[PDB]
Design a protein around this ligand. Structure first.
Ligand SMILES: CC(C)[C@@H](NC(=O)[C@H](CS)NC(=O)CCC[C@H](N)C(=O)O)C(=O)O
Ligand SMILES: [Fe+3]
Length: 329
């Protein structure tokens, strides 16, 4: 028998305002949730989520094989050596069900010095033909900045929760240099569903994606209304109920590092479900040279002996390790 995770629904709208005590009352709830299962739903968040699923499904349904190859990351097309992160992630019929499209900071252009320097984890986005996908690039770039705004406010909530000034995290989260990414993920309905795309967990649960900590500061996720996620607790894996108006929020391993494990990075997995569904994570990554000084809010003097980690190298390491562990998505 599988239990259900405590995932509180937190009205985050005060984090956009100027009522500081109201922000503290949000921060308290973020602290509580981060110390419990590690997940909460952000509600009253102001993002129009009503068509995100439709647009994601329709883009994947309508993009042709030729277009997928043309946009494909290096793992699927050796001609695209510069596309490590951004671009199309093809399914493999009979073997791999999921397909997805990842894009980065729209401000990463050939003019950007990190592109000029060929710094790892920085790439220029690739986009399909506008006339074949009218409005898609516009929608996607706008969505990036919409979720950027929400994420900056959430980061104020996390900073207050930890006893810091509200810009402790968000001052490192900037449009000119953020390594944050959006992934537009389609999980298809398949009949018959290929068993090779299903992994069996140690506890016997059929899965589409194995256990992992997120590589992020925090993760800001919209999913369509099909229950799939589970979070690991000491009592075992627990189901995360879907909420296809709220945003599912949790800390990544960078936050676990800098708080000296006071806010752990929850371990989650994706159960296999034979259902058309859409999943849109926004990974809140900082700049390549962003460094946050660790602290230990469990200690009277607040001091941590842990090394400040440069975020870019953390991201570099984290993305490769997740591929090595859980497979190329
Ligand atoms: C909701 C999650 C479980 C989602 N999975 C995911 O997004 C998984 C696990 S967090 N994430 C990744 O593979 C990292 C993608 C990083 C991205 N290509 C980039 O370069 O920045 C899913 O639906 O599979
Ligand atoms: Fe994850």
């Amino acid at each position: 028998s599988v239990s259900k995770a405590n995932v509180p629904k937190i009205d985050v709208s005060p984090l956009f305002g100027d009522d500081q005590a109201a922000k503290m009352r949000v921060a308290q709830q973020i602290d509580a949730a981060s110390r419990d299962t590690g997940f909460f739903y952000a509600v009253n968040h102001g993002i129009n989520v009503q068509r995100l699923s439709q647009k994601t499904k329709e883009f994947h349904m309508s993009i042709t094989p030729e277009e997928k190859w043309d946009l494909a990351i290096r793992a699927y097309n050796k001609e695209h050596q510069d596309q490590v992160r951004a671009g199309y992630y093809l399914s493999i019929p009979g073997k791999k069900a999921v397909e997805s499209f990842c894009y980065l900071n729209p401000n990463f252009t050939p003019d950007h010095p990190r592109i000029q320097a060929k710094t790892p984890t920085h790439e220029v986005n690739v986009w399909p033909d506008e006339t074949k996908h009218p409005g898609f690039q516009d929608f996607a770039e706008q969505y990036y900045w919409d979720v950027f705004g929400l994420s900056s406010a959430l980061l104020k909530g996390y900073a207050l929760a930890l006893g810091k000034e509200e810009n402790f995290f968000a001052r490192h989260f900037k449009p000119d240099d953020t390594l944050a990414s959006v992934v537009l993920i389609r999980y298809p309905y398949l009949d018959p569903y290929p068993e090779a795309a299903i992994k069996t967990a140690a506890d016997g649960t059929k899965l589409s994606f194995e256990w992992h900590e997120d590589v992020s500061l925090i993760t800001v996720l919209y999913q369509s209304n099909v229950q799939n996620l589970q979070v690991e607790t000491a009592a075992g894996y627990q189901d995360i109920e879907a909420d296809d108006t709220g945003y599912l929020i949790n800390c990544g391993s960078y936050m676990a590092h800098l708080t000296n494990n006071y806010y752990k990075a929850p371990i989650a997995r994706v159960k296999w479900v034979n259902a058309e569904r859409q999943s849109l994570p926004f990974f809140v990554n900082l700049g390549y040279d962003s460094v946050i000084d660790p602290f230990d809010p469990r200690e009277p003097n607040g001091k941590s002996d842990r090394e400040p980690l440069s975020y870019g190298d953390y991201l570099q390491n984290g993305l490769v390790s997740l591929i090595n562990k859980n497979g190329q998505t």
